[PDB]
């Protein structure tokens, strides 16, 4: 934000706007600014759009560093302590709506994290320890799955009676589902098999298929029953909109 005529204003993917420069600057490469959270902070870049960082200071003895990506679509709005090494915020938004905001502890170690997917679905971790473990939950449209986290993966659990469903997401985005029932009678014990190819879990009881639980790309879950003998799917897959519908499929 330098001038109306000079210092062009470009639309920044992250609900922000950085104003470049017209011709150029005094000693070096282009310059630019942008007002962030009622406390505009200026900085100087190299190119003519927003491909550069924006330094600054806080309203309460701290710092701020808007490290705008080189492609104009990945605001990395940092907010260091006051020295410029210890952090207290790090909400990295993106063009397609992606967004991963973090909060740290009294030593720059990440404490909390909240990943928001393009489609709005969220994945929030809290109480993150040094090892990488912590409380976790996923916000889907209509309900919320709770679970835990480890440097290895995230595990959302849904319990219904003696059956316990587990949705794992590798710290790489890979989804896989498991199902266990402590019941020992073949007549009633529920068991399942995950098909990574079709991304679906097929529940079986006493050798018979009962239902297909599909974990879609759009972060949703659908349920379809088989015919009475378990020889083929029947009807139409139905979208799960409530936590209870899930606990229902597990009965």
């Amino acid at each position, epitope marked *: 934000s330098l001038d109306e005529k000079n210092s062009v204003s470009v639309d920044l993917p992250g609900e922000m706007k950085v104003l470049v420069s017209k011709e150029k600057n005094k000693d070096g490469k282009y310059d630019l600014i942008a007002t962030v959270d009622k406390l505009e902070l200026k900085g100087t870049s190299d190119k003519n759009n927003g491909s550069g960082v924006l330094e600054g200071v806080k309203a309460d003895k701290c710092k701020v560093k808007l490290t705008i990506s080189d492609d104009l679509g990945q605001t990395t709005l940092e907010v260091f302590k006051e020295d410029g090494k210890t952090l207290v915020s790090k909400k990295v938004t993106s063009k397609d709506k992606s967004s991963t905001e973090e909060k740290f502890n009294e030593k720059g170690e990440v404490s909390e994290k909240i990943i928001t997917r393009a489609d709005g679905t969220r994945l929030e971790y809290t109480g993150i320890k040094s090892d990488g473990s912590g409380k976790a939950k996923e916000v889907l449209k209509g309900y919320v799955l709770e679970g835990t986290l480890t440097a290895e993966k995230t595990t959302l659990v849904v319990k219904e009676g003696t059956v316990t469903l587990s949705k794992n997401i590798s710290k790489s985005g890979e989804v896989s589902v498991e199902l266990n029932d402590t019941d*020992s*009678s*073949a*007549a009633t*014990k529920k*068991t399942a*098999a995950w098909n990574s190819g079709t991304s679906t879990l097929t529940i*079986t009881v*006493n*050798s*018979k298929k009962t239902k297909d639980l599909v974990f879609t790309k759009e972060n949703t879950i659908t349920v379809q029953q088989y*015919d*009475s*003998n*378990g*020889t083929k799917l029947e009807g139409s897959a139905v979208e799960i909109t409530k936590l209870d519908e899930i606990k229902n499929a597990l009965k």
Partner: antibody, heavy 113, light 108 residues
Framework: QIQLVQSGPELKKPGETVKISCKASGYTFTDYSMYWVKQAPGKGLKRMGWINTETGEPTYADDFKGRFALSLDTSASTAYLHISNLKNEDTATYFC??????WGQGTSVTVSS | DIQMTQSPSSLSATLGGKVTITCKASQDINKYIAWYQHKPGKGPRLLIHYTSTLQPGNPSRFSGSGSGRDYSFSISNLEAEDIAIYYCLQYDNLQRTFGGGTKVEIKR
């Protein structure tokens, strides 16, 4: 409780037909397929085929095409195994099964003159 | 259909000992194997389902394990009355198939 009881021991002459019955009680006949298994001396247990109890469609195993038939009487929760043109290779014991936890007591068939 | 090659086809063990029968499928069967005990003149009795779950009504001397295409079943602390023919069964498919069976005899 749940039980599959079958018809008694049969003694037939070569070329005849035998119809084995399997009555289901204690569960909803229509919720499980119903399998048939052949137990020949020297052989272990071999699946002959199974039948969809909801629709009656029978699906046979390769070694049992032709002379064999699977039918049902839903009104009586009973399945049937038909074997026509009996040959000595048919003298053995036959079982019906449902799910993983039910087997009839089996029925011995002797093909002799 | 999926083949189940079970082995050995016959065992002769001493009382109190442990016996292991294995079953190899021609393809992944996702843990859907069951093991039955077949004593003469009676119907096959379910012992283990879903590769390792003990069906209620049976002593824990019976157990199973495995995954993919490879499974095993055991009888530990072999009792005098355990003689019988044991069978694996895959039911991952509608065309369920049986292993050849294993005759368990007592060595005394």
């Amino acid at each position: 409780q749940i039980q599959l009881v079958q018809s008694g021991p049969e003694l037939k002459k070569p070329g005849e037909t035998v119809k084995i019955s399997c009555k289901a009680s204690g569960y909803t006949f229509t919720d499980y397929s119903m399998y048939w298994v052949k137990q020949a001396p020297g052989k272990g247990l071999k699946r002959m085929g199974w039948i969809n109890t909801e629709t009656g469609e029978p699906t046979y195993a390769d070694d049992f095409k032709g002379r064999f038939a699977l039918s049902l009487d839903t009104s009586a929760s009973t399945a049937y195994l038909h074997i026509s043109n009996l040959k000595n290779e048919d003298t053995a014991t036959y079982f019906c099964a449902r799910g993983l936890d039910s087997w009839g007591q089996g029925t011995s068939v002797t093909v002799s003159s | 259909d999926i083949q189940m090659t079970q082995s050995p086809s016959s065992l002769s063990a001493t009382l109190g000992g442990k016996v292991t029968i294995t079953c190899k499928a021609s393809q992944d069967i996702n843990k859907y194997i069951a093991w039955y005990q077949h004593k003469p003149g009676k119907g096959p009795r379910l012992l283990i389902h879903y590769t390792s779950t003990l069906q209620p009504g049976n002593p824990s001397r019976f157990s199973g394990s495995g995954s993919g295409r490879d499974y095993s079943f055991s009888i530990s602390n072999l009792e005098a009355e355990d003689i019988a023919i044991y069978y694996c069964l895959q039911y991952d498919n509608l065309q369920r198939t049986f292993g050849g069976g294993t005759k368990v005899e007592i060595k005394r």
